[PDB]
Amino acid sequence: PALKLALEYIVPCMNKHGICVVDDFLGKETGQQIGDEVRALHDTGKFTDGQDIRGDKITWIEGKEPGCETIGLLMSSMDDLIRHCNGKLGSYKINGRTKAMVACYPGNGTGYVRHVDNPRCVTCIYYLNKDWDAKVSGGILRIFPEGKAQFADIEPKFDRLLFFWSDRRNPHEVQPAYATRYAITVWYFD
Ligand SMILES: O=C(O)CNC(=O)c1nc2cc(Cl)c(Cl)cc2[nH]1
Numbered sequence: 001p002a003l004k005l006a007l008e009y010i011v012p013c014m015n016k017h018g019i020c021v022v023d024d025f026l027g028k029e030t031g032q033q034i035g036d037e038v039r040a041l042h043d044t045g046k047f048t049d050g051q052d053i054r055g056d057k058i059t060w061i062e063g064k065e066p067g068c069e070t071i072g073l074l075m076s077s078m079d080d081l082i083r084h085c086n087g088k089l090g091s092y093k094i095n096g097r098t099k100a101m102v103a104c105y106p107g108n109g110t111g112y113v114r115h116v117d118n119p120r121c122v123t124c125i126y127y128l129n130k131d132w133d134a135k136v137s138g139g140i141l142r143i144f145p146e147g148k149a150q151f152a153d154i155e156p157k158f159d160r161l162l163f164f165w166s167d168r169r170n171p172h173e174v175q176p177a178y179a180t181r182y183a184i185t186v187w188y189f190d
């Protein structure tokens with residue numbers, strides 16, 4: 001229930017850590033339906049080059065396109081969490097969000113050099129990779145939260161939702177992927 005997830009977990013977590021992970025966000029059935037939609041997009045060659053900086057291929061999805069209705073459901077689900085966060089007494093307001101950025105790292109040692117997404121703004125990432133073994137497949141998101149002496153390594157696990165502040169508080173990189181690695185990102189801003 002968004003009301004509870006936002007107010008009891010996401011807000012305090014974002015306040016304390018600036019990074020929040022929610023596993024099993026939508027469940028396996030819905031998650032694999034999104035997986036199947038992303039693969040269909042990928043199989044038709046609709047992804048364009050995300051660019052020495054990044055090896056990903058991407059497409060932007062509004063959520064109402066034929067074949068994209070479950071991706072639209074994911075977006076509505078993220079929207080509701082953000083709405084409950086920004087509706088808290090004393091909170092700043094979000095005025096917009098991007099379309100869904102569907103991204104594929106097509107193995108072959110592709111990754112993303114360390115960067116800052118927006119050098120407020122929140123990055124929301126939903127991962128789609130079932131039984132991902134990072135030891136063999138790579139693709140770890142390494143994040144450097146401000147204030148911590150350690151970095152955090154986040155596996156791009158199926159049905160995992162990740163929030164983090166998009167600004168210089170959270171530089172991050174995608175370590176090289178050696179298997180096809182899928183994710184969907186939405187940025188919430190202003
Ligand atoms: O809870 C407090 O004492 C301050 N924090 C906030 O107002 C707050 N507003 C927020 C809005 C968004 Cl969209 C997100 Cl992800 C976290 C937030 N945290």
Ligand SMILES: O=C(O)CNC(=O)c1nc2cc(Cl)c(Cl)cc2[nH]1
Nearest residue numbers: 103112117125141156172173174183
């Ligand atoms: O896939 C992950 O686990 C992380 N991905 C990224 O950091 C990432 N950051 C990005 C920033 C921009 Cl501006 C664009 Cl277009 C794609 C990105 N992809």
Ligand SMILES: [Fe+2]
Nearest residue numbers: 115116117172
């Ligand atoms: Fe990024």
